[PDB]
């Protein structure tokens, strides 16, 4: 989510700023005091090809492309010097000893890679030479996913000595292997991403952002997730945001009759079609908005 409101002024390590956040359609009293983190993803509770079994989930590729759970991931690189022994600068091969083999030193400008360039594995991001003629104490970018240099400064440490501070950013969309969760504790790994025309759709054109297995419910008994979809389905059509705080009086029978008041079915299920074949399922499918949240466990980092 918005992990901090002053993020551009900070140089943090392993911090993710998710661009888009939504208030839940069924919110709680906790959202009066903290900013909500997540999105009101449309979720279909159905079997679709077997790619959603055992905590697996099927994501819409179009939902990913539009920025769903997308954000920027940050890393820092702090490099200190020795007093008058070490210095920042581009090493030269003629007089410097033990340069890194097969390393790129050509992106450096005055010892630091300039802000705005893409650094890949095997690039030197900070040039650092110690004088004895010189020993190459440089720092190489050892990550398999490329970054972009976001901010470079040379602040003064506690001992009034210069050190190098680098901020690297990563454009992180949702991708296969990333972890999402509902507010009822049902966490899943994105297993398959389908295009728009391959996702299932209802008679009215509604398609899900996520397809979760119905088998995640019966043993886990996360009934607040199913009630949230039922309530939020009528919230969206009515144009309202309600409160779903714990221990508030609810009646699932009356919340289900609220669906039929808005033109839907009692169970919230709709006639659905297979996006690949164009054929309708014989069973109506429970599809509706369920607030989902992306857990900061990235497959690119693991």
């Amino acid at each position: 989510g918005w992990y901090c409101f002053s993020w551009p002024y900070r140089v943090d390590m392993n911090r993710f700023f998710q661009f888009y956040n939504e208030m839940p359609l069924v919110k709680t009293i906790a959202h009066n005091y903290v900013i909500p983190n997540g999105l009101n993803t449309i979720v279909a509770y159905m079997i679709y090809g077997g790619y959603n079994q055992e905590d697996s989930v099927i994501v819409s590729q179009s939902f990913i492309d539009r920025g769903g759970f997308a954000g920027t991931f940050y890393r820092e690189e702090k490099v200190e010097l020795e007093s008058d022994i070490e210095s920042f600068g581009k090493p030269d091969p003629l007089i410097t000893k033990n340069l890194k083999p097969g390393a790129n030193y050509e992106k450096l400008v005055d010892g630091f890679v300039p802000v705005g360039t893409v650094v890949k594995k095997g690039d030197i991001i900070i040039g650092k030479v110690a004088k004895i003629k010189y020993i190459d104490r440089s720092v190489m970018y050892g990550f398999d996913e490329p970054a972009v240099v976001d901010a470079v400064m040379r602040p003064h440490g506690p001992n009034d000595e210069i050190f190098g501070l680098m901020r690297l950013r990563y454009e992180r969309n949702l991708n296969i292997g990333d972890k999402m969760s509902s507010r009822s504790g049902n966490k899943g790994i994105a297993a398959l991403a389908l295009p728009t025309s391959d996702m299932p759709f209802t008679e009215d054109g509604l398609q899900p952002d996520l397809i979760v297995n119905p088998h995640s419910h019966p043993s886990r008994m996360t009934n607040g997730q199913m009630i949230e979809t039922t309530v939020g389905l009528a919230n969206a059509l009515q144009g309202v945001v309600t409160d779903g705080t714990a221990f508030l009086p609810i009646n699932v029978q009356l919340l289900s009759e609220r669906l039929a008041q808005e033109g839907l079915r009692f169970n919230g299920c709709q006639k659905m079609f297979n996006g690949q074949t164009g054929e309708y399922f014989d069973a109506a499918i429970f599809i509706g908005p369920t607030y989902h949240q992306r857990l900061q466990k990235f497959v690119l980092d693991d």
Partner: protein, 43 residues
């Protein structure tokens, strides 16, 4: 530091270095479901 302090525990010589090993040519990743793969296949 002592010579015999290197031996005893789970982080010691015998259990960390002799009964186990850091190895090369190995990969790790998050696992995911795929119904088009056979049971004896890994994607």
């Amino acid at each position: 530091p002592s010579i015999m302090r290197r031996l005893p525990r789970k982080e010691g010589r015998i259990r960390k270095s002799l009964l186990g090993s850091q190895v090369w040519s190995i990969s790790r990743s998050t696992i995911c479901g795929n119904s088009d793969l056979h049971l004896d296949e890994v994607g």
